[PDB]
Ligand binder design. Structure first.
Ligand SMILES: [Mg+2]
Ligand SMILES: [Mg+2]
Ligand SMILES: [Mg+2]
Ligand SMILES: [Mg+2]
Ligand SMILES: [Mg+2]
Ligand SMILES: [Mg+2]
Ligand SMILES: [Mg+2]
Ligand SMILES: [Mg+2]
Ligand SMILES: [Mg+2]
Ligand SMILES: [Mg+2]
Ligand SMILES: [Mg+2]
Ligand SMILES: [Mg+2]
Ligand SMILES: [Mg+2]
Ligand SMILES: [Mg+2]
Ligand SMILES: [Mg+2]
Ligand SMILES: [Mg+2]
Ligand SMILES: [Mg+2]
Ligand SMILES: [Mg+2]
Ligand SMILES: [Mg+2]
Ligand SMILES: [Mg+2]
Ligand SMILES: [Mg+2]
Ligand SMILES: [Mg+2]
Ligand SMILES: [Mg+2]
Ligand SMILES: [Mg+2]
Ligand SMILES: [Mg+2]
Ligand SMILES: [Mg+2]
Ligand SMILES: [Mg+2]
Ligand SMILES: [Mg+2]
Ligand SMILES: [Mg+2]
Ligand SMILES: [Mg+2]
Ligand SMILES: [Mg+2]
Ligand SMILES: [Mg+2]
Ligand SMILES: [Mg+2]
Ligand SMILES: [Mg+2]
Ligand SMILES: [Mg+2]
Ligand SMILES: [Mg+2]
Ligand SMILES: [Mg+2]
Ligand SMILES: [Mg+2]
Ligand SMILES: [Mg+2]
Ligand SMILES: [Mg+2]
Ligand SMILES: [Mg+2]
Ligand SMILES: [Mg+2]
Ligand SMILES: [Mg+2]
Ligand SMILES: [Mg+2]
Ligand SMILES: [Mg+2]
Ligand SMILES: [Mg+2]
Ligand SMILES: [Mg+2]
Ligand SMILES: [Mg+2]
Ligand SMILES: [Mg+2]
Ligand SMILES: [Mg+2]
Ligand SMILES: [Mg+2]
Ligand SMILES: [Mg+2]
Ligand SMILES: [Mg+2]
Ligand SMILES: [Mg+2]
Ligand SMILES: [Mg+2]
Ligand SMILES: [Mg+2]
Ligand SMILES: [Mg+2]
Ligand SMILES: [Mg+2]
Ligand SMILES: [Mg+2]
Ligand SMILES: [Mg+2]
Ligand SMILES: [Mg+2]
Ligand SMILES: [Mg+2]
Ligand SMILES: [Mg+2]
Ligand SMILES: [Mg+2]
Ligand SMILES: [Mg+2]
Ligand SMILES: [Mg+2]
Ligand SMILES: [Mg+2]
Ligand SMILES: [Mg+2]
Ligand SMILES: [Mg+2]
Ligand SMILES: [Mg+2]
Ligand SMILES: [Mg+2]
Ligand SMILES: [Mg+2]
Ligand SMILES: [Mg+2]
Ligand SMILES: [Mg+2]
Ligand SMILES: [Mg+2]
Ligand SMILES: [Mg+2]
Ligand SMILES: [Mg+2]
Ligand SMILES: [Mg+2]
Ligand SMILES: [Mg+2]
Lengths: 116, 155, 70
RNA sequence: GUGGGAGAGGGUGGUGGAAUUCCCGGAGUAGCGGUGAAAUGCGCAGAUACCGGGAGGAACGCCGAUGGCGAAGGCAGCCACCUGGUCCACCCGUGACGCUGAGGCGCGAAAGCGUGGGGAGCAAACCGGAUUAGAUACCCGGGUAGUCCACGCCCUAAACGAUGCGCGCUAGGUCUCUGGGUCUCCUGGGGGCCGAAGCUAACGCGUUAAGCGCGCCGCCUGGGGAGUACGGCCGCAAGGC
């Protein structure tokens, strides 16, 4: 009900899940999907297959609002990070550009024991 | 086969059809090393398929074997504790042994009394897309594309 | 590949305000390139690091950037 | 003395961007999170993911080094002021003014103590969830002291090169930081690696000695009992010598 037709797709890939948000060119989201939004429940969310179906579900959801062009933004290291992009290219949405914007601190906050 | 590649056995061409796939199918019918009995089964089963159907038993045999070939299957692989059913393609050689073994196994699950009756009826049903053997094939390709979530463990 | 000192003129390593040459020392991201890629000496690199950080506070050099690939 | 040098050496004030958390707004649904699997947890009072604004605390990515500085502990954003050590060139000045150093005095990571602040992230204890034969644990979700600041204590350490300080002497080769030079190189002062002679039980050390000598301080004399008991000094206590 908006007819945006061009916008951004953020891929948030972590080792436990991949989730995709699709926004208008000034950043406000339109639709979204994830490994949990499609059927998967447990550790299967952080699989590349889930990443595929997640990207594709958010892709078809953005078709409804009439999207064609997409600027891909990627954050995180995770399985199916590449597998989710490859899904977005094939989804029919023309992929304008791809940028990796993973936030790395300049060593400011003490990490949980897991990450030291 | 730890050292070598374990070359494939080259079977004798058929006495009747001159086809090696026939002999290989005859051998799966054989039990206790009675190849004479197992041939008379298959060939008498070719009379059945060619009378009850006005077609060439050779082409139906192949067309049946083709419909039972599985394009994918699942195997197990030990990963982080308990293992997983991993989908992966089927070698063209393994599609041979599996389709042939399944056809013989399916036909002997059949109601029909005599052996050659069961072979012919199975081959016919298999070539038409039904019958017990095509079930084992359609059920295997269902394991893959269900565990499709583990296509990254290809190995 | 070439090194940055190899393809450049005679420049002031201490002038924090000259962006055209200082920009040639950052990477695709705002990162300060290693000596392997700047061709600088041990002492020259120490001076570059400090001048680049000065230019970053004046708003002339970027602290970090976004990679357009992958 | 003069003229030059390099440096996360110290103290004080100021300041910059990235990131985490929290709050405000926008947009936006059904989950997020987490693991070997999970579950507790959080989410329809709208989370996660996304854009914008703000607050606050802590630590400085790249540069970054096998690098540098310091007596040791230890020292990394940037700026300014106050300040210590140190090296080189000149051969100018004093004229043995030196070395070490029981006692004393000061410094002394982390943890811990007191008083008053601060409190984002992390996190003993603790509260849960899992695992398990059990789980007083490893893994997961929370979380207080604490970690940070000021002022005052505490004085331990694998405080390690497990190698006290200074001086002289005894093949070289090679990598390096920083000076000076008539700048393939020479010559100092550091930091490394091979290795002459020699030493060493062996490993190994070898112009940065574990070689050859000299001066001075500390210290050892089988293991357990035991860094315990007693006494003394110190400490608010923990405790230390
Ligand atoms: Mg998961
Ligand atoms: Mg960090
Ligand atoms: Mg910390
Ligand atoms: Mg940190
Ligand atoms: Mg780690
Ligand atoms: Mg993380
Ligand atoms: Mg990391
Ligand atoms: Mg890592
Ligand atoms: Mg670490
Ligand atoms: Mg790490
Ligand atoms: Mg086992
Ligand atoms: Mg197993
Ligand atoms: Mg199993
Ligand atoms: Mg399994
Ligand atoms: Mg003079
Ligand atoms: Mg300093
Ligand atoms: Mg300072
Ligand atoms: Mg300071
Ligand atoms: Mg909100
Ligand atoms: Mg639920
Ligand atoms: Mg939570
Ligand atoms: Mg909570
Ligand atoms: Mg609820
Ligand atoms: Mg609930
Ligand atoms: Mg924000
Ligand atoms: Mg606050
Ligand atoms: Mg980092
Ligand atoms: Mg880092
Ligand atoms: Mg580094
Ligand atoms: Mg570093
Ligand atoms: Mg060092
Ligand atoms: Mg030093
Ligand atoms: Mg140390
Ligand atoms: Mg000074
Ligand atoms: Mg004189
Ligand atoms: Mg005189
Ligand atoms: Mg005299
Ligand atoms: Mg003394
Ligand atoms: Mg005194
Ligand atoms: Mg102390
Ligand atoms: Mg402390
Ligand atoms: Mg305190
Ligand atoms: Mg925590
Ligand atoms: Mg915890
Ligand atoms: Mg057990
Ligand atoms: Mg600390
Ligand atoms: Mg130490
Ligand atoms: Mg000893
Ligand atoms: Mg000792
Ligand atoms: Mg000496
Ligand atoms: Mg020179
Ligand atoms: Mg030297
Ligand atoms: Mg060598
Ligand atoms: Mg060697
Ligand atoms: Mg050699
Ligand atoms: Mg020798
Ligand atoms: Mg020896
Ligand atoms: Mg030896
Ligand atoms: Mg050696
Ligand atoms: Mg000498
Ligand atoms: Mg000596
Ligand atoms: Mg003693
Ligand atoms: Mg004794
Ligand atoms: Mg004993
Ligand atoms: Mg003992
Ligand atoms: Mg004992
Ligand atoms: Mg004992
Ligand atoms: Mg003892
Ligand atoms: Mg003992
Ligand atoms: Mg004891
Ligand atoms: Mg004794
Ligand atoms: Mg003790
Ligand atoms: Mg006594
Ligand atoms: Mg006592
Ligand atoms: Mg007392
Ligand atoms: Mg007590
Ligand atoms: Mg106690
Ligand atoms: Mg004690
Ligand atoms: Mg005691």
């Amino acid at each position: 009900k908006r007819q945006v037709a061009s916008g951004r797709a953020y891929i948030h890939a972590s080792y436990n899940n991949t989730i995709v948000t699709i926004t208008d060119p000034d950043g406000n989201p339109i639709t979204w999907s994830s490994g949990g939004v499609i059927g998967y429940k447990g550790s299967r969310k952080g699989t590349p297959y889930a990443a595929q179906l997640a990207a594709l579900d958010a892709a078809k959801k953005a078709m409804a609002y009439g999207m064609q062009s997409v600027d891909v933004i990627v954050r995180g290291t995770g399985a199916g990070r590449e597998q989710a992009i490859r899904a977005l290219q094939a989804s029919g949405l023309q992929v304008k550009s791809i940028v990796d914007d993973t936030p790395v601190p300049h060593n400011g906050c003490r990490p949980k024991k897991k990450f030291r | 086969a730890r050292r070598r590649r374990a070359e494939v056995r080259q079977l004798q061409p058929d006495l009747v059809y001159g086809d090696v796939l026939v002999t290989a199918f005859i051998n799966k019918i054989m039990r206790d090393g009675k190849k004479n009995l197992a041939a008379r089964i298959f060939y008498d089963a070719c009379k059945i398929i060619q009378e009850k159907t006005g077609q060439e038993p050779l082409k139906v045999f192949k067309q049946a074997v083709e419909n039972v070939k599985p394009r994918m299957e699942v195997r197990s692989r030990r990963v982080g504790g308990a293992n997983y059913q991993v989908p992966m393609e089927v070698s063209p050689r393994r599609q041979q042994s599996l389709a042939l073994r399944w056809l013989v196994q399916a036909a002997n699950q059949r109601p029909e009394r005599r052996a050659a009756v069961r072979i012919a009826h199975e081959l016919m049903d298999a070539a038409e897309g039904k019958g017990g053997a095509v079930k084992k094939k359609e059920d295997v390709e269902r394991m893959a594309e269900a565990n499709r979530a583990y296509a990254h463990y290809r190995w | 590949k070439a090194k940055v000192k190899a393809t450049l003129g005679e420049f002031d390593l201490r002038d924090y305000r000259n962006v055209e040459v200082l920009k040639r020392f950052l990477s695709e991201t705002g990162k300060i390139l290693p000596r392997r890629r700047t061709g600088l000496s041990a002492k020259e690199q120490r001076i570059l690091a400090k001048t680049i950080k000065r230019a970053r506070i004046l708003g002339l050099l970027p602290f970090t950037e976004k990679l357009v690939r992958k």
